[PDB]
Design an enzyme around this catalytic site. Structure first.
Site: not given
Lengths: 439, 150, 432
Positions: A71, A140, A144-145, A179, A206, A228, A254
């Site tokens: 988008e 995420s 969908g992206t 969501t 979240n 964030n 490591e």
């Protein structure tokens, strides 16, 4: 040397990458212009910035990251910002159509159209680098992206680079709050791809962030910026011994070598600490033993799960700031004798000691205060399998009568893939329960 | 003990029990509507329980209740409203033992918990069998569902 | 780039479209002349969605006015913004529809359709890529109903990959305007359920009742209803016109809010409907908006959603408040009011907040939900039509056109099937 390439897919991935980049530039004194205009009063910057940034012949810094999204409404939003003079427009690829919480389109009819361009971009970025260790793929499960395009790109990156580490960072649909509705649709298909084609995967939600912020930071109207910032701080803490040094440097290889006990069990439990506000960092004495004890508390975990339900198989232990080895030894001696913390009857001990001389920095206008030392832990326990159990139960409720499936059928995809993902998740849960049970 | 009752007092006791049943049955009828709403249908069960809702009620009061595979209903010993708490509303069922007043817990969409005390151990075995059928199959409803709409 | 082509049909459709164009011009800062007089930021980037780039910065509207009576174009042209549109788009015939669907579709729908097809094809070819087509019309007449259905069918046949969204006006037995309105409604429902993506329900009686009991207007007229529907349309489209944090588009809503193609009807609604004397005494918060969106009093439907079960719910917000309050509100609503939505499918409410507030108002939120309340309208239309077809009155007009009577038979069979499907899906039981 120690250089890696970050991947940002979807709106959440792009915003997390932006937060990480701004945190890195402020903590390293990198000005938003991309040069060093500090000619009157210096304030730092004489360090090893080659890990993330690049040095040109004129003194300019070029970010090394992949900002891709289906988008354009995120690309233009970032482009009209104040840091638009830092990156390059070629790294931000727009798109006509997007997925927007859809897997079939973004995996077959949308994501398959922009492949050659991103592969050329990532190949050029890798060629511009000398030493490559791993990747930072930000996406995420709900988006969908961030699901279909992410899966199709990582499937090619796995077969194009096998010796390189393949990390994963995304957002988990919380069982209580959510969501969208079609989140499990994308999650059930993304988990198979991330399990059978990746080496490690980190899972967060979240709701736990909301609980910890209202409990410690004490905010009534939260926002995505703090969410964030927490993720950026966690990422910086994980990759702390790469940009800097210390008594015992802990590189990516490591810890990822020991963080994976089995090819099927690679879902660690992160816990950042101290997650406190300014007033919570003034009248509170901070040592190592207390925060290490608090790291095992269920209230401070970013995944809603009681650790007492299962037991730990492997733990990865990290630090950042002025930390004294005696405090670490005392904390280890205290936790090894704690009856509350459960562990397998086979692994008496396992952890790491990462001492970082550089203390964490602060942000002007943020909520994080000045803390002398930081701490991050990566443990492996079987009590987290309930989230997959709830996801499978949901998928069964929402697949029994085929709700919102005719759309995917019309788009073009095999219905049997749902049964395949279901049985693969069931097999993974059976493996987890077999590992969890002792002799 | 049955011996004791037989040779001592049995027949006169059962005549007096005749009389006591007659004394009860001639008094009230509002319970009849509740039982009629409950008797012998898709309503799997029909019986009386002492009721604890949320901490609204932490003290026992005998009420009347209903048990359908699709809904649970209850009435307050002659309540006008047929109070509704459907199986499709509830999401869990447990058994609780409150001071030997044994009862069945259930948690609902609404952040609600209902605790229903059927009187004695056989009546409780009965009502708990019916609930271990009804709401555990409302939880098995998920694995029993996929056949009857498409 | 992504643009939306707007279409017009029916006198009521034409007036509401003109009202919407005036509203959006006022909100985005356009003078009646044709130039730009705005002072915002996002009013220049995505402004080309409904406008077109021309010399001198003079944006032009993108809408084709289809009508059969020339008396409408003069009325809308003499308005304050009637001099800014494209006169070429005003394609009108010489004979009126006479509130006839069949006559308008055959006679006034054969030799006039070519011009509108040519102009809409030219408009589509003028742009790079499009998403869908918006048509606003009414079922009360032969102009909007007799022509919009055919237009939608043709554009669907030519370009199947486009969004078919409309805001047709449902009739009301209490508030009628046409004697043969049941016939026209019955004929239009078949096309709406066969060759239409989605459709929204528009009622005038409910709007009148709302503005009478809440707005408390002195002399409420069609201008008020046009303003309300224009505000509703703007609030629906702010997901694409003004991007924010969680943006949305029409197609995602259509896919997510429609479980089955046979049921694509909706129920719009706006939150701040207060009187003039209460605007200076209000508390702008989340729970108040949640209550004014959940109650049936604020709903513009001429029916009761409480008679059925909620199927699909979308709450589109337009402002700068939060994200946590919306989810906690919907969670506790689904918790308490459990007997009002389908228990089989949890989380039936979609969250959407537009960070860009509207012009002139700070807090605005719309509501696009599909609740189980249209069954009453469907069954009453079926009852009136089945009655209306028994003795076959007001039918010689349609027969003299030559269109037969089997079409009414197939339409009534279709509506009987649809109402049966709706009623057997209302009681969506969990198990046997």
């Amino acid at each position: 040397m120690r250089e890696c390439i970050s991947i940002h897919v979807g709106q959440a991935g792009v915003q997390i990458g932006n937060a990480c980049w701004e945190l890195y530039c402020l903590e390293h004194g990198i000005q938003p212009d991309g040069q060093m205009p500090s000619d009157k009063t210096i304030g730092g910057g004489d360090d090893s910035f080659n890990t993330f940034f690049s040095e040109t012949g004129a003194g300019k810094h070029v970010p090394r990251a992949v900002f891709v999204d289906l988008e354009p409404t995120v690309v233009d939003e970032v482009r009209t910002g104040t840091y638009r003079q830092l990156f390059h427009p070629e790294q931000l690829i727009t798109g006509k159509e997007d997925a927007a919480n859809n897997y079939a389109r973004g995996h077959y009819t949308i994501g398959k159209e922009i492949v050659d361009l991103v592969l050329d971009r990532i190949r050029k970025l890798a060629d511009l680098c000398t030493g490559l260790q791993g990747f930072l793929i930000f996406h995420s499960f709900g988006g969908g992206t961030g699901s279909g395009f992410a899966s199709l790109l990582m499937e090619r990156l796995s077969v194009d680079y096998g010796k390189k580490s393949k990390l994963e960072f995304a957002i988990y649909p919380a069982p209580q709050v959510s969501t969208a509705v079609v989140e499990p649709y994308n999650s059930i298909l993304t988990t198979h791809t991330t399990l059978e084609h990746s080496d490690c995967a980190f899972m967060v939600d979240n709701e736990a962030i909301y609980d910890i912020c209202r409990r410690n930071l004490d905010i009534e109207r939260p926002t995505y910026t703090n969410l964030n910032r927490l993720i950026g701080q966690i990422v910086s803490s994980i990759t702390a011994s790469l940009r800097f040094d210390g008594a015992l440097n802990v590189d990516l290889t490591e810890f990822q070598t020991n963080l994976v006990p089995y090819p099927r069990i690679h879902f660690p439990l992160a816990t950042y600490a101290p997650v406190i506000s300014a007033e919570k960092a003034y009248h509170e004495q901070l040592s190592v033993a207390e925060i290490t004890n608090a790291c095992f508390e269920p209230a401070n975990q970013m995944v809603k799960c009681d650790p007492r339900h299962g037991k730990y198989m492997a733990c990865c232990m990290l630090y950042r700031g002025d930390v004294v080895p005696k405090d670490v030894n005392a904390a280890i001696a205290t936790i090894k004798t704690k009856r509350t913390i459960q562990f397998v009857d086979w692994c008496p001990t396992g952890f790491k000691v990462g001492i970082n001389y550089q203390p964490p920095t602060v942000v002007p206008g943020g909520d994080l205060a000045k803390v002398q030392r930081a701490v991050c832990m990566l443990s492996n326990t079987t009590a987290i399998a309930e989230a997959w159990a709830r996801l499978d139960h949901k998928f069964d409720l929402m697949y029994a009568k085929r709700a919102f499936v005719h759309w995917y059928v019309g788009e073009g995809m095999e219905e049997g893939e749902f049964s395949e993902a279901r049985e693969d998740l069931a097999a993974l849960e059976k493996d987890y329960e077999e590992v969890g049970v002792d002799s | 003990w049955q011996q004791e009752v037989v040779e001592t007092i049995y027949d006169a006791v059962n005549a007096d029990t005749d009389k006591i049943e007659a004394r009860r049955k001639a008094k009230n009828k509002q319970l009849g509507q509740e039982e009629d709403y409950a008797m012998g249908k898709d309503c799997i069960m029909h019986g009386y329980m002492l009721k604890l809702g949320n901490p609204f009620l932490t003290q026992w009061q005998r009420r009347y209740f209903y048990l359908f595979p699709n809904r649970l209903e209850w009435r307050g010993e002659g309540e006008s409203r047929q109070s509704l708490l459907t199986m499709e509303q509830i999401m869990s069922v447990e058994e609780t033992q409150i001071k030997d007043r044994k009862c069945i817990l259930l948690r609902i969409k609404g952040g609600k918990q209902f605790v229903l005390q059927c009187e004695s151990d056989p009546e409780f075995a009965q009502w708990l069998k019916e609930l271990t059928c009804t709401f555990n199959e409302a939880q098995r409803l998920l694995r029993r569902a996929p056949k009857f709409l498409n | 780039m992504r643009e939306i082509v707007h279409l017009q049909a029916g006198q009521c459709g034409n007036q509401i479209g003109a009202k919407f164009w005036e509203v959006i011009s006022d909100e985005h800062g356009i003078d009646p002349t044709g130039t730009y007089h705005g002072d915002s930021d996002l009013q220049l980037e995505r402004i080309n969605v409904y406008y077109n780039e021309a010399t001198g910065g003079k944006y032009v509207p993108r809408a084709v006015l289809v009508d059969l009576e020339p008396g409408t174009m003069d009325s809308v042209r003499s308005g304050p913004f009637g001099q800014i549109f494209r006169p070429d788009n005003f394609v009108f015939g010489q004979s009126g529809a006479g509130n006839n669907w069949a006559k308008g579709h055959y006679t006034e729908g054969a030799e006039l359709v070519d011009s509108v097809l040519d102009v809409v094809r030219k408009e589509a070819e003028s742009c790079d890529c499009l998403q869908g087509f918006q048509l606003t019309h009414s079922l009360g007449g032969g102009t909007g109903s007799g022509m919009g259905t055919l237009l939608i069918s043709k554009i669907r046949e030519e370009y199947p990959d486009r969004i078919m969204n409309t805001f047709s006006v449902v009739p009301s037995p209490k508030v009628s305007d046409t004697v043969v309105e049941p016939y026209n409604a019955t004929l239009s429902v078949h096309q709406l359920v066969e060759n239409t993506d989605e459709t929204y329900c528009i009622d005038n009686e409910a709007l009148y009742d709302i503005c009478f009991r809440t707005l408390k207007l002195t002399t409420p007229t069609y201008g008020d209803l046009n303003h309300l529907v224009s505000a509703t349309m703007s609030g629906v489209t702010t997901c694409l016109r003004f991007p924010g944090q969680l943006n949305a588009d029409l197609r995602k809503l259509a896919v997510n809010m429609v479980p089955f193609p046979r049921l694509h009807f909706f129920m719009p609604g706006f939150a701040p409907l207060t009187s003039r004397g209460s605007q200076q005494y209000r508390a702008l918060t989340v729970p108040e908006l949640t209550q004014q969106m959940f109650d049936a009093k604020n709903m513009m439907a001429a029916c009761d959603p409480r008679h059925g079960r909620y199927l699909t719910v979308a709450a589109v917000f337009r402002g700068r408040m939060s994200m946590k309050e919306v989810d906690e509100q919907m969670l506790n609503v689904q918790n308490k009011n459990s007997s009002y939505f389908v228990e089989w499918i949890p989380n039936n409410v979609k969250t959407a907040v537009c960070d860009i507030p509207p012009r002139g108002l700070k807090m605005s939120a719309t509501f696009i939900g599909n609740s189980t309340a249209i069954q009453e309208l469907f069954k009453r239309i079926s009852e009136q039509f089945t009655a209306m077809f028994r003795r076959k009155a007001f039918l010689h007009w349609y027969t003299g056109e030559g269109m037969d009577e089997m079409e009414f038979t197939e339409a009534e069979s279709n509506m009987n099937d649809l109402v049966s499907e709706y009623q057997q899906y209302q009681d969506a039981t969990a198990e046997e």
